[PDB]
Amino acid sequence: MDIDPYKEFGATVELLSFLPSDFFPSVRDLLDTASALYREALESPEHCSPHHTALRQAILCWGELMTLATWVGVNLEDPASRDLVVSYVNTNMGLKFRQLLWFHISCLTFGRETVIEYLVSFGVWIRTPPAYRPPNAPILSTLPET
Amino acid sequence: MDIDPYKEFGATVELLSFLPSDFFPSVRDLLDTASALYREALESPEHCSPHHTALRQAILCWGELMTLATWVGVNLEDPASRDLVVSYVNTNMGLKFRQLLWFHISCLTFGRETVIEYLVSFGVWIRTPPAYRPPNAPILSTLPETTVVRRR
Amino acid sequence: MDIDPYKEFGATVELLSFLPSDFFPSVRDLLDTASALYREALESPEHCSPHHTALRQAILCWGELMTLATWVGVNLEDPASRDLVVSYVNTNMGLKFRQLLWFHISCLTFGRETVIEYLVSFGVWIRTPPAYRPPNAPILSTLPETTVVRRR
Amino acid sequence: MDIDPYKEFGATVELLSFLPSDFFPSVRDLLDTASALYREALESPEHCSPHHTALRQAILCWGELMTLATWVGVNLEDPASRDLVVSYVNTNMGLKFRQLLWFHISCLTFGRETVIEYLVSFGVWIRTPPAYRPPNAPILSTLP
Amino acid sequence: MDIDPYKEFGATVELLSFLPSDFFPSVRDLLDTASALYREALESPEHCSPHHTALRQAILCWGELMTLATWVGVNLEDPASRDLVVSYVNTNMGLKFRQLLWFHISCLTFGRETVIEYLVSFGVWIRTPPAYRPPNAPILSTLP
Amino acid sequence: MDIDPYKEFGATVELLSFLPSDFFPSVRDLLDTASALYREALESPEHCSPHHTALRQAILCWGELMTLATWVGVNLEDPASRDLVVSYVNTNMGLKFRQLLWFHISCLTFGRETVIEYLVSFGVWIRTPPAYRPPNAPILSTLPETTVVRRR
Question: One GO molecular function term (chains D, E) (predicted)?
Fold first, then answer.
């Protein structure tokens, strides 16, 4: 079955690929951000939003993957195999999780539509040659202008 | 951060613990049932209900796990380490996926409250000692077992 | 082309694939039943329903296959080839034809919405492991108590 | 069981017997035409018409027969019987499939009336003796 | 990117594949016809129709390719590669240009419906076996 | 024939010929942008606008040119001829294609009347000699202050 994790929200894996891989923060900062801002709501027994349920599923899966990594670290008897698998897991699933968490945390903080607008603007600016674009990179902010 | 995947639906992992680990069907049967009943909803561009969102997330994760399994299948030379990894992944994640799929599929077809009522009935019947259990264990169905329809 | 024969009727190959091979009667029983109940309607030049058209095509196809079986049985000098061909044809196409005939006859007798529900019930009951399965399957029948008394 | 596939559609085998067996095109051209013009409908979840229903069953049946042709090609070791079976299946059932496909494709494209009057007429042209038969055989066309 | 040039106009490559490659006229006859009938419109400052837009781009592209054919003819010294390049450019891209020009010129002259029914029908005449194919192949005409 | 591709849109080759070669992004950027913003509209079977039709023709033309580049790269035995042909094709047609794609994408994003004014402004500023030219060119941008705050 062909399922896209962003289609229910209107976003596409073709819109997220548009930004460069090095843009997204590390998992440690995104998990800390989530713990700081939304821990209580996530543990709430109500369906606050579809964003909360997606975050809940993604966090539990990452936990299970980390448990698997630790079990491979105790069980697996040779250094090359354990090293190879720890690298593979960390890099590929970390990048995927990083994109998904950044998208949902930004949608909750700034509004999904506003976040998508910011994404498009930033992608467009990274294509424009530097002599012919505004000098400061676009950033999301929540301070008032006054 | 401590999250329970059932708690937003008003069940608990402890309530499901009443079911024995070998109760749940195989992964292939659950995926076949989902393919038969719900493909068009799951693909559709609407958040029809929280159950569809949860199913969507679970399926993608299982898919990525299978991809990793196949990648380990190519990459590692030593058979024993890859065999250990594959057996671990299949057994441990398979059982968890099996439970979550059974729960969300049953809640969609029968109704979440109806599924909770079954769980309770199954638990009550399994506590009874074997010398006194009636042989008709509870099962979820929509029909009288002896349904007769007389057509004109 | 890829086609699902059931999709036009709102069922799927997946949903029917849970029925075991012991469930279907013999081809001789199904042809007897189809004739005894519907010969005149089938021979009518009217589009009575899509079920009638599907039954018509299938019957003629099986007739042609039986003609092929009689031809191979005459022409080939080697009994091993004859036996291999006849056994393959009878077992595989007879089982496929048996499933399709049972589906259309049941839809005509009971009605589709009813057949969908009964099929779903069977699929749910059969996936239950035998240690927990109640001993008697769901039955679909036109005689509820097999005692026939003067109608009203 | 007195089962004529054209009878529910208002023709008969006997009427269709006016066309010689050499007339009908190859199975490949018919399948190509069907794939080009009706692929979407023949795979959609509706009975658009009974012509749509009959075509689906026929296609699936040819599929099963071709699958059997593949099984025979592998599992019999005597080449002579294997060839005899393949040649018989292709020639005899392919002729019937070609007739049925041509009839339903033509009925969908031109309409029953257009096709059937055409049968009755091509027939009239073929009964004419060679010395008076015009070289332009009748042909179906939508151009006014 | 799933880009079929006929799809926005209600045909497909697959339908257009009924015509053999020998059928389409030479590029010179098509360009002569376009110059004789639409030179004024194809050079006026309006989008009279999307057929007018598609034709302009195609003509400019053929122009650039022919300019490249002139540059290759001068700047490569090995004659064998120079000839191979010229022959490849002319044969392969000229076939595609001929198909596209024929389609748009015909759609402008006779109208989409007239052209397309014609495709569906010429196709029907070609699938007929040689022993029964009438010698008069279908042809587009405006005469009543 | 002689044709101006811009004349149907109310611009001319002359007006655009003032833009320098350093102004246009790479072809890889423009194809990425065109896909990311308009793939579904382009694949729609509807005449959304003449801009869509022009973009469609150009994309297919560039695809065919790239096919030619791969063919020449295989078939020719002499690397000098290959390099001369590939470099010519890439530089001249890539620059032409880059200009046309930038024009149509900008017209779709900003709107034509706006693009005309901006082009005229650039042409006026660029013809000024550098000793008197103010140091920063006119900019056309969708983000005025590159600080993005919750919309109204």
Answer: DNA binding
* Elucidation method: cryo-EM
Chain F residues inside the 8 Å CB shell of E8? 44-47, 53, 56
Cβ–Cβ contact B133 with A under 8 A: no
B43 at interface of A, judged by CB pairs closer than 8 A = yes
* Chain D neighbors of C101, CB-CB under 8 A: none
Please tell me what resolution, in angstroms, this structure has: 2.9
* CA–CA dist B37, B5 (Å, integer): 23
Chain F neighbours, 3+ Cβ pairs < 8 A: A, E
Amino acid (1-letter code) at residue C30: L
Angle at F25 between CA A100 and CA F11, to 5 degrees: 120
CA atoms within 13 A on the CB side of C65: 24
Pull the structure tokens for residue D68: 């059997």
Find all residues with CB under 8 Å of D80, minimum gap 6, and list them. Answer: none
**Is residue B76 within 8 Å of residue B82, measured between CB atoms?**
yes
CA of D127 vs chain E CAs: smallest distance (Å): 15
For chain B, say whether C94 makes contact (Cβ under 8 Å). no
User: Of all helices (H) and strands (E), which one includes residue D88?
Assistant: helix D79-88
Chain C: residue nearest D79 by CA? C81
DSSP chain F: ----TTGGGT--HHHHTTS-TTSSPPHHHHHHHHHHHHHHHHHSSS---HHHHHHHHHHHHHHHHHHHHHHHHHH-S-HHHHHHHHHHIIIIIHHHHHHHHHHHHHHHHH-HHHHHHHHHHHHHHHHS-TTTS-SS-----S-SSSEE----
| Secondary structure (H, E, C), chain B | CCCCCCHHHCCCHHHHHCCCCCCCCCHHHHHHHHHHHHHHHHHCCCCCCHHHHHHHHHHHHHHHHHHHHHHHHHHCCCHHHHHHHHHHHHHHHHHHHHHHHHHHHHHHHCCHHHHHHHHHHHHHHHHCCCCCCCCCCCCCCCCCCCCECCCC
Residue in C closest to D42 by C-alpha: C3
Of B29, B109, B137, the CB nearest to C132: B137
**Mutation for testing the C interface, residue in D35, D49, D72, D81 having most C CBs under 10 Å:** D81
